[PDB]
Structures are given as C-alpha cells and as structure tokens.
Design a protein around this ligand. Structure first.
Ligand SMILES: Cc1cc2nc3c(=O)[nH]c(=O)nc-3n(C[C@H](O)[C@H](O)[C@H](O)COP(=O)(O)O)c2cc1C
Ligand SMILES: CCOC(=O)c1sc(Nc2ccc(C)c(Cl)c2)nc1-c1ccccc1
Ligand SMILES: O=C(O)c1cc(=O)[nH]c(=O)[nH]1
Length: 350
C-alpha cells in the first residue's frame, strides 16, 4: 500500500502475502492464442514476472497462481550480501515510475539452491505444463573475478533452472555494466557457456544475457556480434535506465539508481527493435520495461520480443494488471489479424 508503507516495506509485504498464497487465484484462463514455444520450452502465456520482485525464490508458486506464464527469480549472488543502505527504492507516482538502488541484496546461492530443491519436482511438473522458471545471476560487490561469480551461479542454480540469465546490466554495482563491452563480454560468456555445457542434459538450461537500455549503437552491435558468435540462447531487453528522460515530475526523480516503469517503456521497445534486427530475428528476446497493458506488451512483441515481463506496473496497479495485460493482449491480437502471439513476434520488421 503506497499510503501507509514505504516502498521497500510494501515490497516485503507483497512477497510475503504472495508466498503465503493469500491472494485469490486468477480467474482469467489462458487461451491457446497466448501459447509460445521458445528456449526449448512451452510457455502457456508470454507474460512473466521480471527479476527483482522475488530476488530469493520465496514466492515462485504464488506468482504462477497470480497468472504469470513464467517466473524469473534473482538476481542471486554467490555469497549472501545485504546491498545498499536504506532507503534504496523510491516511488514516482506522477510518472508511474520507480527508482531503485538495492545493489544485489541476496540470500546467496546456497540458500536459494536449498529453497528451489525443496520444490524441484513440483517445478518440473509446472515446466512440463508450460510454466517455466528462470534464474537471474548476479555478482558479489567485493568479488575479484566477475566471470567466476557467474560460473559458480551456473553450477549451483543452472541445474534447477529452465533458463539462466547473466545479468550484466544492473546500474547499482560498480563496474558491472562494463561487462557488456565486447572483449569482456566474450570472455565472460565463453566461460559461462562452458560451465553450462558441462551439466547433465536434463539439467541443462538455456542461457540469456540481460542488457541495459543505455547502450551506445556500438555496444549493441558488439553484443549482437558476440551473441551470434557464441550461440547465446537469448536476450533480456532491458534492465532499468540510469538516464532521466525530460518530463519526469516526481519529487524523487534525482535519486541515484535505476529508473523503471512507464518512462522506460519506449526506450526499452526501441532496444528490442534494434537487437531483433542486429540478430536477424534468430535470437529470442524477452521484452521488459514499462509494460502495464496489452498494447504495451504487443508493441514489444511486434518489435521482436517472443516473451515479455513486467515489474513496476505491479507497484501501482497490483495483481489485477496481470489478467488485464493478458486479456488486452488477446483482444488486440484478434483485432490486428494475428492467429496468436507467435505470428506477431517481429511483425513490425515485416
Ligand atoms: C525494485 C527493482 C529491483 C530490481 N532488481 C533486479 C535484479 O535484481 N536483477 C535484474 O536483472 N533486474 C532487476 N530489476 C529490473 C527489472 O527486472 C526490469 O528489468 C525493469 O524494472 C524494467 O521493467 P519494469 O518497467 O516493468 O519494472 C529490478 C527492478 C526493480 C524496480
Ligand atoms: C501500492 C501497492 O504497494 C506497493 O507499493 C507494491 S505492491 C506490489 N505487488 C503486490 C503483490 C501482492 C499484493 C497483494 C499487492 Cl497489493 C501488491 N509490489 C510493490 C512494490 C515492489 C517493489 C518496490 C516497491 C513496491
Ligand atoms: O539489485 C539491484 O539494485 C538491481 C539489479 C538490477 O539488475 N536492476 C536494478 O534495477 N536494480
């Protein structure tokens, strides 16, 4: 509740209620129009919950009950760490936006591993039922070897994930976004893919890279190049922005951190559009940033996303926004002549 609670307290409460299943199960049932097959899995609908809401994998099942077609947990760092001092998250209600600088507060790999192991066979059934699980990997603040942090994550949580996310676009960890550079990115992902390939086949996840919305045209070309060279399975586009677009009204607009929500929407859609084209439409993209409606989702899908995620809209509109986005997405697909989600992926480019 934006009234009583500060944002971080509201978030903890949200996670708690969601994990305890206290919310009613969604009434909207998914039509076959919403089904997507990508990353070696079936997704019953293309609307997922973005990393950062369930950082430690405490609410996964509550999130499916909420109606998401897939769930991404994380980011998870190898060792536990508390992240930045409070306050570190801020509401900009006049912008339908949020700024955060958590800094990878994480329970760490071991705790998350044990937590996911407790429901591992339950998740295997959910996945076969079209409800996949992603795990987002981060790096410890004081870590000396970034690649080794990610390698650890691949080894410990890779066996429990349908897909893994190499998060190299968080704005709240010194030096992390420079891992998006060509030489550094190639070296890092080579190591990550090696570790992933060393896992037993039924425990072998797709590997995706999550990139910033603040990249130069050169960064983007280089990333597409490396992605195609190493055979990375996909891209998550995008993380929060360190920019502050003209027009922000919120009093807290000059807080340090990453901006999410509606002011990020089109910046993120344009990044999807550019990455889809640079990768010739052969690399699956999960579109994320300021989705709050069916139209927002469909614009990202037409720009090239096969899947979409939201987080910040859930801050202003609560759980109903999930059904709303799915219902509108279906209505818009019919209106514009698409048989389903799959036919609309990349349609803007044709
Ligand atoms: C409070 C908060 C925490 C987040 N934490 C993470 C994170 O730990 N790892 C990550 O890859 N993205 C994180 N994100 C980014 C979201 O996953 C998403 O990329 C971004 O917020 C844009 O989507 P949105 O506008 O729907 O919120 C976080 C976002 C917010 C608002
Ligand atoms: C106004 C709603 O309260 C919030 O601000 C909320 S509300 C929310 N999701 C959420 C989840 C479950 C319930 C029952 C409700 Cl109701 C909301 N998440 C946040 C939040 C998350 C991260 C940072 C800040 C806030
Ligand atoms: O932990 C963070 O603060 C965080 C990570 C991330 O990937 N994106 C974000 O906006 N914040």
């Amino acid at each position: 509740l934006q009234g009583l609670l500060d944002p971080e307290s509201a978030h903890r409460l949200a996670v708690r209620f969601t994990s305890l299943g206290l919310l009613p199960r969604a009434r909207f049932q998914d039509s076959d129009m919403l089904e997507v097959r990508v990353l070696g899995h079936k997704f019953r609908n293309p609307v997922g919950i973005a990393a950062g809401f369930d950082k430690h994998g405490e609410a996964v099942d509550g999130l499916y009950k909420m109606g998401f077609g897939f769930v991404e947990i994380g980011s998870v760092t190898p060792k536990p760490q508390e992240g930045n001092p409070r306050p570190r998250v801020f509401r900009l209600p006049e912008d339908q936006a949020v700024i955060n600088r958590y800094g990878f507060n994480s329970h760490g790999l071991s705790v998350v591993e044990h937590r996911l192991r407790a429901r591992q066979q339950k998740q295997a059934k959910l996945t076969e039922d079209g409800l996949p699980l992603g795990v987002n990997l981060g790096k410890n603040k004081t870590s000396v070897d970034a690649a080794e942090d990610y390698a650890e994550g691949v080894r410990v949580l890779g066996p429990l994930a349908d897909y893994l996310v190499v998060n190299v676009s968080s704005p709240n960890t010194a030096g992390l976004r420079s891992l998006q550079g060509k030489a550094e990115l190639r070296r890092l992902l080579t190591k990550v893919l090696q570790e992933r390939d060393g896992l037993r086949r039924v425990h072998r996840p797709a590997v995706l890279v999550k990139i910033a919305p603040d990249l130069t045209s050169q960064d983007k070309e280089d990333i597409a190049s490396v992605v195609k060279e190493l055979g990375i399975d996909g891209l998550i586009v995008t993380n929060t922005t360190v920019s502050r677009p003209a027009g922000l009204q919120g009093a807290l607009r000059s807080e340090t951190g990453g901006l999410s929500g509606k002011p990020l929407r089109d910046l993120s859609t344009q990044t999807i559009r550019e990455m889809y084209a640079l990768t010739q439409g052969r690399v699956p993209i999960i579109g994320v940033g300021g989705v709050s409606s069916g139209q927002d989702a469909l614009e990202k899908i037409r720009a090239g996303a096969s899947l979409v995620q939201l987080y910040t809209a859930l801050t202003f509109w609560g759980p109903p926004v999930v059904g709303k986005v799915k219902r509108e997405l279906e209505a818009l697909l019919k209106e514009q002549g698409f048989g389903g989600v799959t036919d609309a992926i990349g349609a803007d480019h044709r």
